[PDB]
Amino acid sequence: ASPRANDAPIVLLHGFTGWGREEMLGFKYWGGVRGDIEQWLNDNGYRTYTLAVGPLSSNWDRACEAYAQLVGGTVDYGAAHAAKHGHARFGRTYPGLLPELKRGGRVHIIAHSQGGQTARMLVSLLENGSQEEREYAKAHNVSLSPLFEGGHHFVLSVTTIATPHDGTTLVNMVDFTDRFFDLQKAVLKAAAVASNVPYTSQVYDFKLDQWGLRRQPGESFDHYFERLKRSPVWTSTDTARYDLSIPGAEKLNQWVQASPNTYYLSFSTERTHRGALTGNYYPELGMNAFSAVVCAPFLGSYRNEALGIDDRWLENDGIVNTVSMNGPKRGSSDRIVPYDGTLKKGVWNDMGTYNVDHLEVIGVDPNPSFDIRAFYLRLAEQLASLRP
Numbered sequence: 001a002s003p004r005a006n007d008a009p010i011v012l013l014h015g016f017t018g019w020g021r022e023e024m025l026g027f028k029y030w031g032g033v034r035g036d037i038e039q040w041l042n043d044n045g046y047r048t049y050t051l052a053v054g055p056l057s058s059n060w061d062r063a064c065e066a067y068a069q070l071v072g073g074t075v076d077y078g079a080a081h082a083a084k085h086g087h088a089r090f091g092r093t094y095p096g097l098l099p100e101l102k103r104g105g106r107v108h109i110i111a112h113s114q115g116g117q118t119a120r121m122l123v124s125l126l127e128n129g130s131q132e133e134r135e136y137a138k139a140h141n142v143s144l145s146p147l148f149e150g151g152h153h154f155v156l157s158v159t160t161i162a163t164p165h166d167g168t169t170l171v172n173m174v175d176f177t178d179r180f181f182d183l184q185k186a187v188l189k190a191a192a193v194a195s196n197v198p199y200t201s202q203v204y205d206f207k208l209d210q211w212g213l214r215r216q217p218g219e220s221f222d223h224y225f226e227r228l229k230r231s232p233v234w235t236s237t238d239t240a241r242y243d244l245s246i247p248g249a250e251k252l253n254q255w256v257q258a259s260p261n262t263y264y265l266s267f268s269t270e271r272t273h274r275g276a277l278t279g280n281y282y283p284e285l286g287m288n289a290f291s292a293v294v295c296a297p298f299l300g301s302y303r304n305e306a307l308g309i310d311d312r313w314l315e316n317d318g319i320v321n322t323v324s325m326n327g328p329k330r331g332s333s334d335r336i337v338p339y340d341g342t343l344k345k346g347v348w349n350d351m352g353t354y355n356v357d358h359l360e361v362i363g364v365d366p367n368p369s370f371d372i373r374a375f376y377l378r379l380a381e382q383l384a385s386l387r388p
């Protein structure tokens with residue numbers, strides 16, 4: 001029970017590789033083959049909008065982009081941050097999806113996977129701003145984005161679904177494969193090529209503008225090639241891959257903390273079964289093919305006791321370790337409590353673990369057994385029941 005206590009709008013925030021509504025020919029990240037989640041929510045009286053930030057970027061960059069997309073304006077990554085990592089300070093300019101957040105309004109954020117880290121960071125920056133950005137701005141006499149001031153509280157709630165709050169060991173597998181096939185560098189080169197091809201961005205927009213991957217106006221190929229080789233993007237830790245790794249996720253948890261003015265809900269996922277002999281976990285029949293063959297095996301068998309990666313990390317949903325989903329724990333002081341019928345502020349409300357994989361939970365992969373429609377409508381109702 002507990003009816004409508006607020007009419008604050010909802011924004012959907014995708015995770016790693018996530019694309020916007022106008023990309024992928026309309027195939028929705030939030031809905032996939034099952035439908036259009038944003039539309040189902042809107043048709044039911046829940047004002048909903050969809051955010052589309054850097055699919056391969058760091059949570060910091062994605063948070064800054066999310067902020068601009070919400071209140072409108074030109075993306076400002078921060079002069080200190082831009083200088084530190086070697087990329088442009090300013091980005092794209094947006095009209096604003098919810099400028100009402102600038103004058104009292106509040107918003108519910110529903111995020112999937114990496115989106116969970118971005119949402120938490122946006123809240124932390126809004127609330128505390130960035131001391132480093134403030135000091136840098138005053139010391140060099142440059143402008144400061146309101147986002148780094150602190151004292152803002154327009155986010156009412158953050159709901160994470162299958163979010164790797166403590167990271168995912170999948171990155172560890174990528175580290176091993178790096179000795180040969182370097183996945184990140186390959187993805188970047190592909191993005192570099194695409195940035196120069198005409199219509200590509202209409203299908204999949206990499207949103208890596210800050211790195212200047214495309215050949216500029218009168219730039220010759222020769223100059224272009226030389227400039228790219230010198231780019232710091234190839235060896236940068238200012239990427240989603242780093243924030244998603246075990247050590248990167250902890251560093252994020254060290255400063256991104258749960259705000260006492262915001263409600264936090266987490267949903268965990270698993271689509272595996274434990275081997276009686278080894279203790280290792282294997283993908284159930286149904287998990288999307290990609291995950292089942294390429295990711296699940298490593299996720300369900302990789303251990304590193306010295307780093308704290310024990311048997312409790314083997315259960316997974318094909319992409320992320322389940323134990324990493326209930327809330328930040330590694331390098332975190334956040335509190336996680338089991339949902340007891342009453343949602344609380346400043347803590348993670350563990351809404352439970354669901355038998356659906358990483359892609360099925362957003363409809364990208366089919367699973368007739370999963371009533372995706374009901375899951376999101378039921379979530380919307382709970383968010384609407386929250387007391388401001």
Ligand SMILES: [Ca+2]
Nearest residue numbers: 286287366367
């Ligand atoms: Ca399936």
Ligand SMILES: [Zn+2]
Nearest residue numbers: 061077085238
């Ligand atoms: Zn950055």
